[PDB]
Amino acid sequence: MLTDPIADMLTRIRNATRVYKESTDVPASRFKEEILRILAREGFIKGYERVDVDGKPYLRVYLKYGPRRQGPDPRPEQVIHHIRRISKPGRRVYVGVKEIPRVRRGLGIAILSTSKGVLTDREARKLGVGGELICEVW
Amino acid sequence: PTINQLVRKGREKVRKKSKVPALKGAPFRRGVCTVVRTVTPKKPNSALRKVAKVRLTSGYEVTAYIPGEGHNLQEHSVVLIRGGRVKDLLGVRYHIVRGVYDAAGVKDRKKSRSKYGTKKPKEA
Amino acid sequence: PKKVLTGVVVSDKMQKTVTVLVERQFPHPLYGKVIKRSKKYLAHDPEEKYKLGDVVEIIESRPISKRKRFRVLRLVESGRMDLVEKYLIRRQNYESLSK
Amino acid sequence: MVKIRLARFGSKHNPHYRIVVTDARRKRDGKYIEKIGYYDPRKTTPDWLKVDVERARYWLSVGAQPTDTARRLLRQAGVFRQE
Amino acid sequence: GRYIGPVCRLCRREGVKLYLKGERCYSPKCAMERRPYPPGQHGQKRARRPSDYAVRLREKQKLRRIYGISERQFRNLFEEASKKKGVTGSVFLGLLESRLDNVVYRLGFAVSRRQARQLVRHGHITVNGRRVDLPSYRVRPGDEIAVAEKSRNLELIRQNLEAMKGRKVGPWLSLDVEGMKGKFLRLPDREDLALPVNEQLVIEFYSR
Amino acid sequence: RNLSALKRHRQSLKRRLRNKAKKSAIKTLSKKAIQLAQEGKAEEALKIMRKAESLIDKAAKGSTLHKNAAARRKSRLMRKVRQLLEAAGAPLIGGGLSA
RNA sequence: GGCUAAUCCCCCAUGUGGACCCGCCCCUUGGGGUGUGUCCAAAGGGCUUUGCCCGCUUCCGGAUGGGCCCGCGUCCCAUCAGCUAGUUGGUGGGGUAAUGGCCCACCAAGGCGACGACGGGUAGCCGGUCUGAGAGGAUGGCCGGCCACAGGGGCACUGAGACACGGGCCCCACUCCUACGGGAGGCAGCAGUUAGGAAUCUUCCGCAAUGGGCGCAAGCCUGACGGAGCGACGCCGCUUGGAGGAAGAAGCCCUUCGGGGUGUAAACUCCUGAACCCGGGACGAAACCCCCGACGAGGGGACUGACGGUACCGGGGUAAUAGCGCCGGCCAACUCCGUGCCAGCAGCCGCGGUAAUACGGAGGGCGCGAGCGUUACCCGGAUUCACUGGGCGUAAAGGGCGUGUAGGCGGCCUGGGGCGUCCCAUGUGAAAGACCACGGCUCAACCGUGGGGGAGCGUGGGAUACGCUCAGGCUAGACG
Ligand SMILES: [Mg+2]
Ligand SMILES: [Mg+2]
Ligand SMILES: [Mg+2]
Ligand SMILES: [Mg+2]
Ligand SMILES: [Mg+2]
Ligand SMILES: [Mg+2]
Ligand SMILES: [Mg+2]
Ligand SMILES: [Mg+2]
Ligand SMILES: [Mg+2]
Ligand SMILES: [Mg+2]
Ligand SMILES: [Mg+2]
Ligand SMILES: [Mg+2]
Ligand SMILES: [Mg+2]
Ligand SMILES: [Mg+2]
Ligand SMILES: [Mg+2]
Ligand SMILES: [Mg+2]
Ligand SMILES: [Mg+2]
Ligand SMILES: [Mg+2]
Ligand SMILES: [Mg+2]
Ligand SMILES: [Mg+2]
Ligand SMILES: [Mg+2]
Ligand SMILES: [Mg+2]
Ligand SMILES: [Mg+2]
Ligand SMILES: [Mg+2]
Ligand SMILES: [Mg+2]
Ligand SMILES: [Mg+2]
Ligand SMILES: [Mg+2]
Ligand SMILES: [Mg+2]
Ligand SMILES: [Mg+2]
Ligand SMILES: [Mg+2]
Ligand SMILES: [Mg+2]
Ligand SMILES: [Mg+2]
Ligand SMILES: [Mg+2]
Ligand SMILES: [Mg+2]
Ligand SMILES: [Mg+2]
Ligand SMILES: [Mg+2]
Ligand SMILES: [Mg+2]
Ligand SMILES: [Mg+2]
Ligand SMILES: [Mg+2]
Ligand SMILES: [Mg+2]
Ligand SMILES: [Mg+2]
Ligand SMILES: [Mg+2]
Ligand SMILES: [Mg+2]
Ligand SMILES: [Mg+2]
Ligand SMILES: [Mg+2]
Ligand SMILES: [Mg+2]
Ligand SMILES: [Mg+2]
Ligand SMILES: [Mg+2]
Ligand SMILES: [Mg+2]
Ligand SMILES: [Mg+2]
Ligand SMILES: [Mg+2]
Ligand SMILES: [Mg+2]
Ligand SMILES: [Mg+2]
Ligand SMILES: [Mg+2]
Ligand SMILES: [Mg+2]
Ligand SMILES: [Mg+2]
Ligand SMILES: [Mg+2]
Ligand SMILES: [Mg+2]
Ligand SMILES: [Mg+2]
Ligand SMILES: [Mg+2]
Ligand SMILES: [Mg+2]
Ligand SMILES: [Mg+2]
Ligand SMILES: [Mg+2]
Ligand SMILES: [Mg+2]
Ligand SMILES: [Mg+2]
Ligand SMILES: [Mg+2]
Ligand SMILES: [Mg+2]
Ligand SMILES: [Mg+2]
Ligand SMILES: [Mg+2]
Ligand SMILES: [Mg+2]
Ligand SMILES: [Mg+2]
Ligand SMILES: [Mg+2]
Ligand SMILES: [Mg+2]
Ligand SMILES: [Mg+2]
Ligand SMILES: [Mg+2]
Ligand SMILES: [Mg+2]
Ligand SMILES: [Mg+2]
Ligand SMILES: [Mg+2]
Ligand SMILES: [Mg+2]
Ligand SMILES: [Mg+2]
Ligand SMILES: [Mg+2]
Ligand SMILES: [Mg+2]
Ligand SMILES: [Mg+2]
Ligand SMILES: [Mg+2]
Ligand SMILES: [Mg+2]
Ligand SMILES: [Mg+2]
Ligand SMILES: [Mg+2]
Ligand SMILES: [Mg+2]
Ligand SMILES: [Mg+2]
Ligand SMILES: [Mg+2]
Ligand SMILES: [Mg+2]
Ligand SMILES: [Mg+2]
Ligand SMILES: [Mg+2]
Ligand SMILES: [Mg+2]
Ligand SMILES: [Mg+2]
Ligand SMILES: [Mg+2]
Ligand SMILES: [Mg+2]
Ligand SMILES: [Mg+2]
Ligand SMILES: [Mg+2]
Ligand SMILES: [Mg+2]
Ligand SMILES: [Mg+2]
Ligand SMILES: [Mg+2]
Ligand SMILES: [Mg+2]
Ligand SMILES: [Mg+2]
Ligand SMILES: [Mg+2]
Ligand SMILES: [Mg+2]
Ligand SMILES: [Mg+2]
Ligand SMILES: [Mg+2]
Ligand SMILES: [Mg+2]
Ligand SMILES: [Mg+2]
Ligand SMILES: [Mg+2]
Ligand SMILES: [Mg+2]
Ligand SMILES: [Mg+2]
Ligand SMILES: [Mg+2]
Ligand SMILES: [Mg+2]
Ligand SMILES: [Mg+2]
Ligand SMILES: [Mg+2]
Ligand SMILES: [Mg+2]
Ligand SMILES: [Mg+2]
Ligand SMILES: [Mg+2]
Ligand SMILES: [Mg+2]
Ligand SMILES: [Mg+2]
Ligand SMILES: [Mg+2]
Ligand SMILES: [Mg+2]
Ligand SMILES: [Mg+2]
Ligand SMILES: [Mg+2]
Ligand SMILES: [Mg+2]
Ligand SMILES: [Mg+2]
Ligand SMILES: [Zn+2]
């Protein structure tokens, strides 16, 4: 099957961006949609789209990079420098409000899934909820 | 390993053996020379090394090394064992503490004297 | 707070005494993932109302025999015969792993 | 039976007492039921007596027994003062 | 029994001037007047690239020597300065400079650090009016450190004092040369003191 | 040597004695009364049961019994008697028994 | 064998009440209420002696201390895989303050285990301590809590309470008395002895304080306890001096024989004044008691200090112990002799076989200092058991391959519930300790007062994104 939907999302993005692709289809979910909404508003993807490929629902994820590097290796600086899953099917991670990490000196974020819904560490913290810690981004 | 492996079996704390049974956990143990003599060292080194097989309050009969420049020990001297070993000859897990029980201290030693157990000398 | 749990009835074989199988999850104090674990309670069925495969709330009660400290509370559920044939197969399995 | 007493607290030659409710059978310095004051016999500082009447009035009402040294301290604090 | 035995050797090892003698350390003697090399046989030798250890140990020793203090004392102080909230090096200087014996020196009642120690130990000083004899004693600000009334005619006191008339005193202190009384009013920042120690090296030394 | 308030032991015997031959007195009568129930003679039985109950409570006056081993023995007896009074008994005296 | 008193033991009455069987009322496991029968009380003593005090008796509460029971947590070995006959349950009964196979009689044939039963080994748990960035690891001496034991094993008695350390009984081992019949002990209370060991203290003072027993009180008892002693065992404070003092003495070391070094170090000069001597001298102690009032509230009065003529205060006063480890690299600190694979060092690399910064002594130096080394044991480094935080093509490491059991894991959409999860309130999280703040000993160690934090579990209330689960639906996986 696909054992983590989400991981595989994050990954698609990762190998996508590493190879500098202008964007990518990922197979569609209300949740995976939340996550990219957050991921987007928060600066990391150009934005995304709800597409249909071969009669099946996909989300296109458009993809942003920084400008052209000089010298040898002109490959431009990544925006999504790193993205990684935290909670994993059969090993879960749930955090108090006092336990919500904070990321790369605040230069990145966490994504939490709460009963206030999906939100960033900062958002949770001001909201005052905890939840499953989905992912590290920075 | 997976997680479900760590829950299933899970990691193994591993313990360490002792480099010595002075037993007791004792810091030192009293003994009696059974025999005393001189041995040849190991690998690159030549020497005549000074040592005494000693019988113990801990019940075992061991080989200990008599440190420093002269010594006084013979058939049944009685002596104290501290342990710490000698790499260059083998079977010696322990040193004799000089200056205790029937073992003298090394006399004339000016230089490092707590080890070797010699009293501080006076002058004018 | 007189403690009360839930379980399945895995045993008929005593007069007024049923055996109840009760599971609980809880996260692993170190490796941190939920573990599912379970325990068996002999419980007091005065009139032999509960039959096997039933799901029942179970309760803390003044003592009845050695082994018997809980009396049946109510009937929550009728005929989950799956949990039953489950535990029963585990048990049949003991018969390997032997001599 | 239940008693209000003193427990020794400061160091050697520097005693500070704890004014305290507890069963008689107890060790002197061992676990006690409520701390009701402190008393510093050598009067080292401005206030060497805390009592808090309110509460020692209670224990008395419910059958607490003060030791007399305790009683003196107590009543210095007018736990007993009647009107 | 904290260091008692030839000093101008230490002025020397540490390779920069220490004023452990007070006056004369201002003369053309401090021995670092022409013989600034380190002590011993091999002290006039071309010396060798310093280990990173050496550097930080020697920076410690330079501060410890300066203030006259035992290791155990020095460390226990530094530990105590870690613990406190605030920048650890600077606090440490605070705490040093707040030792009674040092205030007594820095108030000018004595020629030298050691001299103030003796001054103290022997009873010649009063803090807020009680005689206080231990050089450890920590001077709070607000505190007034002054010479003992019964001790006010001593030669040594007058020499020092009278010829402190007019010199300015450390800006975290006040002096009154009539009462032989002075106030420690604040705490020294690291540029209030001048010491030729980069303290952070000493932090670095205990980090190991 | 000679701890003098070992005297306590010395008493405990006299005391032990007393206690034993209260208990026993009681035990005997009780048995007898119960017996008379199964013989159906409820006149004689009730009379004896009555004396047993006096005695028990009276011996609960002291250290001997006290408590509720008062009640316990009382209850036990009176029931075993009444319950034993029908193989058809018409409970004659009813000194001790509640109509 | 014989007299004899009581708050000792009985018998009769009174029945506020309580106890028990039976019936009903309410209530929900044996909780209350009530009626009928039955059964159950008691002890005097003192005075300021006709009314007060210390006692007795039955009931109902409080309070404190406990029993018992449940969830959860709680070391190694699977080269321990099966275990179980009071075993597991049931009816009746014994017993007990009380539940229960705690025991007993007769029925049923069950209970338990790879979610590690049974066996073996080891160990008193905890508040906390040590270490660590943390996570973890390791530990449970002192102080508090809980348990167990009292030469080994059984047992009960008395009692509110024990199956009782200085109570009882029997067996056993040991010691001692013995007229050989038979008897007596029990320091794992404080001291002390002996033995064992590398090793662990005075047969001290005191009942002043605090605390406990009895006593109406006076008081008595108190090796609990307050104190003193001995050990650098630890921690903290302090001393063996401060300022001057040479272009820099002798001695000693090095020397390229010019000079370099110890070294302002000494000598010497001038201040100060540890030790010690004199004087004065505590706090810790104010109640019990006694007097007025009313034995209350309140007020007045009296006694009492082991530590101790100690702490502290004032006067006088002497320049007054320093040692131990290191100097080849890890690592701060170098030269000359001596020695010649010897003697020796050695934590590890390794040194020594005639120019040894590595052995041994010297001068010099580095580090700490009334201490400094050593051995032993824990944690660290060691991300070398890897949760944080490792790996498996050749380095150690993918099972020889397959089928599936237990188990782990689980696509897309909607609704229910709300177990996991998140939040809020609340109860618990004793004191000690740790953290912060002020404060008390001249400082500190040590001590007080206050404040803060807290995982975890109980309870009530709330959210529903993710996990579960139940209901529905879909087809991208799977199958046909
Ligand atoms: Mg939480
Ligand atoms: Mg791993
Ligand atoms: Mg060799
Ligand atoms: Mg001999
Ligand atoms: Mg070693
Ligand atoms: Mg010796
Ligand atoms: Mg050596
Ligand atoms: Mg059945
Ligand atoms: Mg039963
Ligand atoms: Mg029920
Ligand atoms: Mg089987
Ligand atoms: Mg007591
Ligand atoms: Mg108790
Ligand atoms: Mg007051
Ligand atoms: Mg800090
Ligand atoms: Mg300032
Ligand atoms: Mg300066
Ligand atoms: Mg600088
Ligand atoms: Mg560090
Ligand atoms: Mg008596
Ligand atoms: Mg008979
Ligand atoms: Mg007679
Ligand atoms: Mg009535
Ligand atoms: Mg009635
Ligand atoms: Mg009567
Ligand atoms: Mg009586
Ligand atoms: Mg009441
Ligand atoms: Mg109660
Ligand atoms: Mg209670
Ligand atoms: Mg209770
Ligand atoms: Mg049977
Ligand atoms: Mg049997
Ligand atoms: Mg029964
Ligand atoms: Mg069977
Ligand atoms: Mg289980
Ligand atoms: Mg253990
Ligand atoms: Mg054991
Ligand atoms: Mg810490
Ligand atoms: Mg680790
Ligand atoms: Mg920890
Ligand atoms: Mg433990
Ligand atoms: Mg002990
Ligand atoms: Mg203890
Ligand atoms: Mg308990
Ligand atoms: Mg025993
Ligand atoms: Mg016992
Ligand atoms: Mg013994
Ligand atoms: Mg026994
Ligand atoms: Mg009694
Ligand atoms: Mg009894
Ligand atoms: Mg009893
Ligand atoms: Mg006994
Ligand atoms: Mg004894
Ligand atoms: Mg006997
Ligand atoms: Mg002893
Ligand atoms: Mg011996
Ligand atoms: Mg002692
Ligand atoms: Mg005495
Ligand atoms: Mg007393
Ligand atoms: Mg008393
Ligand atoms: Mg009394
Ligand atoms: Mg009187
Ligand atoms: Mg006596
Ligand atoms: Mg004592
Ligand atoms: Mg000794
Ligand atoms: Mg010694
Ligand atoms: Mg010692
Ligand atoms: Mg010279
Ligand atoms: Mg010369
Ligand atoms: Mg000088
Ligand atoms: Mg002068
Ligand atoms: Mg003088
Ligand atoms: Mg006098
Ligand atoms: Mg006094
Ligand atoms: Mg006074
Ligand atoms: Mg009295
Ligand atoms: Mg008295
Ligand atoms: Mg009157
Ligand atoms: Mg009167
Ligand atoms: Mg009064
Ligand atoms: Mg008065
Ligand atoms: Mg005296
Ligand atoms: Mg005197
Ligand atoms: Mg004086
Ligand atoms: Mg003077
Ligand atoms: Mg001198
Ligand atoms: Mg001098
Ligand atoms: Mg080092
Ligand atoms: Mg070096
Ligand atoms: Mg030779
Ligand atoms: Mg030669
Ligand atoms: Mg050669
Ligand atoms: Mg040579
Ligand atoms: Mg050579
Ligand atoms: Mg050399
Ligand atoms: Mg070496
Ligand atoms: Mg050497
Ligand atoms: Mg030397
Ligand atoms: Mg010291
Ligand atoms: Mg040491
Ligand atoms: Mg290790
Ligand atoms: Mg680490
Ligand atoms: Mg590795
Ligand atoms: Mg792999
Ligand atoms: Mg190979
Ligand atoms: Mg291989
Ligand atoms: Mg393969
Ligand atoms: Mg293979
Ligand atoms: Mg396979
Ligand atoms: Mg398969
Ligand atoms: Mg399956
Ligand atoms: Mg799903
Ligand atoms: Mg839902
Ligand atoms: Mg939930
Ligand atoms: Mg709802
Ligand atoms: Mg509690
Ligand atoms: Mg606490
Ligand atoms: Mg904190
Ligand atoms: Mg203070
Ligand atoms: Mg403290
Ligand atoms: Mg608190
Ligand atoms: Mg709190
Ligand atoms: Mg904490
Ligand atoms: Mg905690
Ligand atoms: Mg809570
Ligand atoms: Mg909802
Ligand atoms: Mg599942
Ligand atoms: Mg479905
Ligand atoms: Zn100088």
Domain, as residue range, for E117:
97-193
Which stretch of DSSP H or E encloses residue C91? helix C81-94
Question: How far is A4 from B61, CA to CA, in rounded Å?
Answer: 65
What order of strands is seen across the sheet that includes strand A47-53?
A: A23-27, A56-62, A47-53
Distance between start and end Cα atoms, chain F: 64
**Position of tokens 């990954």?**
A11
By the 10 Å C-beta count (0-12 exposed, 13-18 middle, 19+ buried), B51 is classed as buried
Q: How many residues does chain C have?
A: 99
- Token pair for residue F29? 């009568």
Indicate whether A54 and A7 sit together in one domain.
yes
| SS3 state at B96 | strand
* Residue C28 contacts B, CB cutoff 8 Å: yes
The distance (Å) linking the CA of B45 with the C1' of G349 is: 15
Side-by-side strand order, sheet with E173-176:
E130-131, E125-127, E144-147, E181-184, E173-176
Q: Give first-to-last CA distance, chain C, whole Å.
A: 47
Chain G positions with an atom below 7 A of a protein C-beta are 9-11, 18-22, 29, 35-42, 58, 61-65, 68-74, 77, 81-82, 87-91, 93-102, 108-115, 136-138, 143-146, 157-161, 164, 166-168, 196-199, 209-213, 224-228, 236-248, 253-254, 260-265, 270-274, 283-288, 296-298, 313-315, 319, 321-326, 330-335, 341-353, 360-370, 372-378, 385-387, 390-392, 405-414, 419-424, 430-431, 435-436, 439-444, 446-450, 455, 458-459, 462-467, 476-477
- Tokens 């008379």, located at residue: F36
Are E11 and E69 in the same domain? yes
Which ligand is the nearest neighbour of the Cα of F4? 20
Q: Residue B11 CA: which ligand is closest?
A: 2
Q: Which two tokens stand for residue E56?
A: 């930080």
Which residues in B have their CB inside 8 Å of a CB on A? Answer: 3-4
The protein residues having their C-beta less than 5 angstroms from ligand 16 (an ion) are: E 172, 186
**Strand-pair category, C55-65 with C4-14:** antiparallel
- ∠ CA D43-D44-D49 to the nearest 5 degrees? 45
If you count DSSP H runs as helices and E runs as strands, how many of each does chain A have, helices first?
Answer: 3, 8
3-state secondary structure of E34: coil
Give the pair of three-digit tokens for residue F89.
């008994």
| Whole-number Å distance between alpha carbons of E150 and E124 | 8
d(CA F27, CA B61): 73
Specify the CATH number for the domain of residue A124: 3.30.1490.10
User: DSSP string covering E123-177, please?
Assistant: T-EEETTEE---TT-BPPTT-EEEE-STTTT-HHHHHHHHTTTT----TTEEEET
Q: Are residues E58 and E19 in the same domain?
A: yes
Query: In chain B, which residues have their Cβ closer than 8 Å to the Cβ of C31?
Result: 3, 6-7, 10
The helix (run of H) or strand (run of E) holding residue D73 is helix D68-76
At D17, phi and psi to the nearest 5? -95, 145
Q: From residues 26-65 of D, list those within 7 angstroms of strand G by Cβ.
A: 26-31, 33, 38, 40-45, 50, 62-64
Asked how this structure was determined, the answer is: X-ray
Residue E57 and residue E1 share a domain: yes
CB A34 within 8 A of CB A118: yes
The residues, ordered by sequence, that sit 6+ positions from F36 with a Cβ below 8 Å of its Cβ are F42, F44, F45, F48
- Nearest Cα residue in chain C from B1: C31
- Element containing residue A31 per DSSP (H, E): helix A30-41
Please give the tally of structural domains in chain C.
Answer: 1
**For residue D65, how far is its CA from the centre of ligand 29 (angstroms)?**
19
Helix (H, G, I), strand (E, B) or coil at B61: strand
CA of E121 to C1' of G275 (A): 15
Q: Name residues whose C-beta falls within 8 Å of residue F80's C-beta, 6 or more positions apart in sequence.
A: F34, F37
Same domain, E62 and E10: yes
Residues in A touching B4 (Cβ below 8 Å): 90
Cβ–Cβ under 8 Å, residues A119 and A38: yes
E91 and E115 share one domain:
no
Overall domain count for chain A: 2
What residue type is assigned to position E57 of the chain? L
Q: After which residues is chain A broken (C to N over 2.5 A)?
A: none
Contact status, residue E145 vs residue E125, Cβ threshold 8 Å: yes
Phi, psi of F33 (to 5 degrees): -65, -50
Alpha helices in chain E (DSSP H): 8-13, 52-67, 71-83, 88-97, 100-106, 113-121, 155-162, 200-206
Q: How long is the CA F10 to C1' G153 vector, in angstroms? A: 27
β-pair type (C17-27, C34-44):
antiparallel
Angle, CA of C80, C85 and C87, to the nearest 5°: 105
Number of domains in chain B: 1
Report the neighbours of F using a cutoff of 3 or more CB pairs below 8 angstroms.
none
Residue range(s) defining the domain that contains residue A70? 3-80
Nearest to E204 by CA among E74, E60, E76: E60
User: For chain D, what are the domain ranges?
Assistant: 1-83
Say how far apart CA E150 and CA F57 lie, in whole Å: 90
CA E205–ligand 99 middle distance (angstroms)? 23
- Asked if A68 and A133 sit in the same domain, the reply is no
Look up residue A43 and give its two tokens.
Answer: 């600066």
- B24: DSSP letter: T
Q: Bridge-partner residues for D20, per DSSP?
A: D5, D35
Q: Which of E15, E22, E12, E16 is nearest to E111 (CA)?
A: E22
Least Cα distance to E205 among E91, E56, E82 occurs for E56
Q: What SS3 class is residue C5? A: strand
Alpha-carbon distance E21 to E116, whole Å? 11
Determine the residue among A91, A92, A93 to mutate to test chain B binding: the one whose Cβ has the most chain B Cβ atoms within 10 Å: A91
Q: Residues 52-111 of B near strand G (Cβ < 7 Å)?
A: 57-58, 67-70, 80, 82-89, 108-111
In sequence order, which residues have a C-beta less than 8 Å from that of residue A123 and are 6 or more positions away?
Answer: none
Same domain, A70 and A91: no
Q: Could you tell me the CATH number of the domain that includes residue C67?
A: 2.40.50.140
Residue with tokens 């096997």: C52
Q: In the Cβ-directed half-sphere of D6, how many Cα atoms lie within 13 Å?
A: 20
How far apart CA E65 and CA E159 sit, in angstroms, is 26
Whether residues A76 and A134 fall in one domain: no
Alpha helices (H) in F1-99, listed in sequence order: 7-38, 42-58, 69-83
Which class is D1-83 in CATH? alpha beta
β-pairing, E144-147 with E181-184? antiparallel
**Residue B38 belongs to a domain with what CATH number?**
2.40.50.140
**What per-residue string of b and e applies to B79-108 under the rule 16 or more CB within 10 Å gives b?**
bbbbbeebeebeebbbbbbbbbeebbbbee
Residues A108 and A117: their CA atoms lie apart, in Å, by 20
* Pairwise CA distance, residues A123 & A137, whole Å: 15
CATH code linked to domain F1-99: 1.20.58.110
Q: How are beta strands C55-65 and C34-44 bridged, if at all?
A: unpaired
Q: How many domains does chain E have?
A: 2
CB-strand contact F96/G, under 7 Å: yes
Chain A residues lying within 8 Å of C32, measured CB to CB = 91-93
Among chain A residues, the shortest Cα distance to C31 is held by A91
Query: Three-class SS of residue D35?
Result: strand
E86 and E165 inside one domain: no
Neighbours of B58 (CB within 10 A): 16
Chains with ≥3 CB–CB distances under 8 Å to C: A, B
Structural domain boundaries of chain F?
Answer: 1-99
